[PDB]
Amino acid sequence: MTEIATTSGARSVGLLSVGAYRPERVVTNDEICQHIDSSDEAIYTRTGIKTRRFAADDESAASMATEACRRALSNAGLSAADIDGVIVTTNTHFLQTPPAAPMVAASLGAKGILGFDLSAGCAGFGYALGAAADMIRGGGAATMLVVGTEKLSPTIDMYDAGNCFIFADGAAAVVVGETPFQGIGPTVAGSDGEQADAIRQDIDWITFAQNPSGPRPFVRLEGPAVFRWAAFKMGDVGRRAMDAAGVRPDQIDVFVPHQANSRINELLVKNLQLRPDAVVANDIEHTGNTSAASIPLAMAELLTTGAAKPGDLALLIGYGAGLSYAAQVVRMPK
Amino acid sequence: MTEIATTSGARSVGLLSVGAYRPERVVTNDEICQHIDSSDEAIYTRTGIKTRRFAADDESAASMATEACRRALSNAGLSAADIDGVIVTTNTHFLQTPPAAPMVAASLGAKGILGFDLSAGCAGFGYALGAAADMIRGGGAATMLVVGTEKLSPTIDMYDAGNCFIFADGAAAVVVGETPFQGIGPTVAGSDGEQADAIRQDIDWITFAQNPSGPRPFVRLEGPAVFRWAAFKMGDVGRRAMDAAGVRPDQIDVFVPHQANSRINELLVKNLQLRPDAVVANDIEHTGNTSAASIPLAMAELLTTGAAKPGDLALLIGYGAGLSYAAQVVRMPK
Question: Where along the chain is the active site annotated (chains A, B)?
Answer without folding.
Answer: 122, 258, 289
